[PDB]
Amino acid sequence: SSVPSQKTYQGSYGFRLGFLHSGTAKSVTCTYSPALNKLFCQLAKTCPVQLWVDSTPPPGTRVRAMAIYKQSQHMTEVVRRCPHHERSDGLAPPQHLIRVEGNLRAEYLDDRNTFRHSVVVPYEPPEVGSDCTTIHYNYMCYSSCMGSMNRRPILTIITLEDSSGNLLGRDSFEVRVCACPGRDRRTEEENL
Ligand SMILES: [Ca+2]
Ligand SMILES: [Zn+2]
C-alpha cells in the first residue's frame, strides 16, 4: 500500500520546525520534547508550531498539516476525530483532528483519492521582531479517545509546498493530546 511520507526534507529553503522552550511546569498547556521529538498538549488548546527557514520561499507558498498513525500496523488507517468529539469555528470539517486557530485563510482538504484529512494555510514570513513563523494548531481528540486514536500514537507531518503543490520541505513530530502535558512529558523523558 501507499502511506504519506514522513521523511525529513529541509529542501531549498532550509525548512524545519521549531517549538517554544516551554518546560514542564504544571501550568503548561503545550510543551515539546526535543529528545522524543514529541509535542504534548491539551484538548483543543493552542499549540504554537514554528516554521524556520534559511531563505524566504516564493509568494504563493503554502503550509500543510496532516496526521498519520505512527505504528506500521495502523499507518494505512485514516486519522479522524472520534464520533463523540465530532458531534466548532465553522471553518473546520467536524471529522478533522487538526484545525488551525486564528487564520481565516485556512483551507481544509478531504483527499479525493486517499481520503486523508489535512489543513493548509498560506506561508507568511516572520513578523517584525521575529525569526520564525508561528502557526497555532488545535488537536480535537485525546490520544486516549476510544473512538479515534485509542491510545495509538500519531505523528503530525508539516509540509511546505509551492502554489502548484510541489513539495518544498517536510518535517514531523509525534503528538500526545492529554490532560497534563507537563507531567506526561517529564515522565516519558524519565525512561531515557
Ligand atoms: Ca525536525
Ligand atoms: Zn475524541
Side-chain angles (χ1 to χ4, degrees):
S1 67
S2 173
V3 303
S5 176
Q6 64 181 84
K7 188 166 176 175
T8 300
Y9 179 53
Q10 290 213 348
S12 296
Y13 307 99
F15 174 76
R16 72 284 188 182
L17 302 169
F19 306 81
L20 292 173
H21 305 300
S22 301
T24 59
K26 71 174 178 187
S27 69
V28 309
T29 58
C30 185
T31 187
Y32 173 76
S33 166
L36 302 167
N37 184 209
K38 180 168 183 178
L39 188 74
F40 296 76
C41 59
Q42 290 179 310
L43 180 71
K45 291 190 187 180
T46 307
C47 295
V49 174
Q50 310 170 338
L51 315 181
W52 291 75
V53 296
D54 292 327
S55 50
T56 302
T61 298
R62 315 211 303 151
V63 186
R64 183 175 308 274
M66 177 187 295
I68 65 168
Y69 281 111
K70 183 186 173 207
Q71 294 162 298
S72 54
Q73 57 269 36
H74 302 297
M75 202 168 286
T76 61
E77 181 179 326
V78 174
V79 179
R80 299 192 177 85
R81 189 176 181 198
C82 73
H84 170 56
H85 284 119
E86 167 181 354
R87 305 184 72 171
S88 178
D89 63 357
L91 288 288
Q95 300 197 178
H96 277 222
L97 175 70
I98 307 174
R99 297 180 182 175
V100 168
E101 171 185 358
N103 194 336
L104 281 183
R105 301 172 58 183
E107 165 187 323
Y108 293 83
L109 175 71
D110 276 359
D111 196 283
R112 60 192 170 206
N113 293 148
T114 67
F115 307 127
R116 291 189 188 269
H117 301 167
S118 60
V119 57
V120 61
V121 297
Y123 169 84
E124 299 165 359
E127 301 296 330
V128 171
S130 176
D131 280 348
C132 62
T133 297
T134 295
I135 295 175
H136 286 342
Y137 287 111
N138 295 163
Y139 290 86
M140 312 303 304
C141 268
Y142 287 106
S143 298
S144 65
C145 278
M146 294 201 284
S148 56
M149 287 74 256
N150 188 41
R151 300 172 188 292
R152 291 175 293 179
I154 57 169
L155 300 183
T156 294
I157 301 173
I158 304 300
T159 52
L160 192 66
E161 49 186 70
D162 67 13
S163 67
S164 302
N166 297 305
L167 175 77
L168 306 184
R170 191 190 291 109
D171 198 355
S172 60
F173 54 97
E174 182 176 339
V175 176
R176 171 181 174 79
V177 183
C178 54
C180 310
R183 177 186 66 176
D184 286 359
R185 171 176 166 204
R186 202 184 293 183
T187 298
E188 285 189 35
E189 285 175 358
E190 118 200 320
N191 291 64
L192 284 34

